[PDB]
Symmetry: D3
Subunit: 57 residues, 6 copies
Amino acid sequence: PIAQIHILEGRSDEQKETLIREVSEAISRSLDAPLTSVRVIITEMAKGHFGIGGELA
Amino acid sequence: PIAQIHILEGRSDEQKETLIREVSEAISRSLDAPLTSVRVIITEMAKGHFGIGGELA
Amino acid sequence: PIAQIHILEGRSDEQKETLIREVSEAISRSLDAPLTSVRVIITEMAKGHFGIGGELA
Amino acid sequence: PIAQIHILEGRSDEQKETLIREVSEAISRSLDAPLTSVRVIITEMAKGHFGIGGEL
Amino acid sequence: PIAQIHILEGRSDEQKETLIREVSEAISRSLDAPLTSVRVIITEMAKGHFGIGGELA
Amino acid sequence: PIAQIHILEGRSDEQKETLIREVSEAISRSLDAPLTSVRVIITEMAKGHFGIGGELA
């Protein structure tokens, strides 16, 4: 499984490290897939690049 | 936050609902983001559409 | 410019054709880019494949 | 509805703001979807990262 | 490396296998990356779902 | 055809230009599509943003 997660910029390296591990374990557990087969890509969004309802967040 | 997860075809409806819930909670805990703000997209891959090392998986 | 739009299943062909035209024109005018350079990809999501707050939408 | 738009780098903040607003109404109107449910992600591409016909 | 390729539906299975092998090798040679680390995802587009210049493909 | 390739950060501009060219030709050759129709997007991943098996790669 391959996961791409879009998140707002501003979290620490440590926090993103935690995100990758926790999500990867979640995918492995949910799907009964080998942990080693799970890849996660974190994509950061700048504040001026993410809109909800046509307006900036 | 928005997660798009590519997975191989063959999973049950039950596994995919669990995947969405478990990845969403993992995201929520890891980033201290409200659960209600987490969105997850499941994308299924057919066996002839996923390659590893230039060969079909 | 390349736009990928994830939408829920259930929309008509005209609605999607209109979606493609209006989004392409909106991109073209906002960015002063030639309409002919604008590409739009519609990706339909099955009901069990889209999550909000850890639950199906 | 969620739109991810890949655009070339170099545009200013006001133009990207306009892009977000204009695309969001277009999606909303076309699909008879609530404006507030429409999400737009702008992804900027550096000039050395986007190829057409094998060349930048 | 992870490659996602959007193409219009209508190609043969053989044709998509060739695409996956050829793209994987091109990535491998260009990056001096082991072929085995290269993953390719093919995403097919339905005829009514791809727009160029505001018009259907 | 549109290919998005996620690669780890750190390559020079000329190597990525080579990657774009070689992948584009492979796609053109495999699908018998006019090269002018092939679009390729390079997306660099920071080291702290790419996980394999829940750990940074």
